[PDB]
Design a binder for this molecule. Structure first.
Ligand SMILES: [Cl-]
Ligand SMILES: [Cl-]
Lengths: 111, 111
């Protein structure tokens, strides 16, 4: 067992998480009426750690379609309307022990 | 200073984050051509810790519009087509020292 763990709905962090969640639900709803918690049937919490990778990368369009092999070292386009380049900023959230990675943020401006 | 910290683009976690990010960029692009890193201009990493709150909550629609006061203790609707209830599951990602909260996951089924 390495999963979540029960917590009383009294504990303040729960209390704040709940109000937050409910706030967000109402904010996103199309209902003109306000909804609120009727009953918190179960509350669990879990401390997690991960690593954010913040990459500032320059990307170039290669000459290879995504349907061919050897894309890793494939030649960049150099022709007039085919060549494109972009400066990008990536944020990857990694949780090592789980082997997972998540693209948290991603923007690119064609330079 | 409590922000990110430089890392060589050699370090494997960076290397994996980069391939991941680039993979995700290509996957989401409308381009038939494959793009790849031209140059990693900057690489930084940062270890973060937070708490996931996992709430299983039953919500009820109140009689108050979102434009009035005292929504916290506002009466639930009980009339035929106005009363609604929903069982929901919320995941809130909190980063204590920063006072931030994020709604990571959210589903509700009108029961
Ligand atoms: Cl851990
Ligand atoms: Cl920390």
């Amino acid at each position: 067992v390495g999963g979540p763990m029960d917590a009383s709905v009294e504990e303040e962090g729960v209390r704040r998480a709940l109000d937050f969640a409910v706030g967000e639900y109402n904010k996103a709803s199309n209902d003109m009426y306000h909804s609120r918690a009727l009953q918190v049937v179960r509350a669990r919490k879990q401390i997690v750690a991960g690593v954010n990778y913040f990459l500032d990368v320059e990307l170039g369009r290669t000459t290879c379609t995504k349907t061919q092999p050897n894309l890793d070292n494939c030649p960049f386009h150099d022709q007039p309307h085919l060549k494109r380049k972009a400066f990008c900023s990536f944020q990857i959230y990694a949780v090592p022990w789980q082997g997972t990675m998540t693209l948290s943020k991603s923007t690119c401006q064609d330079a």
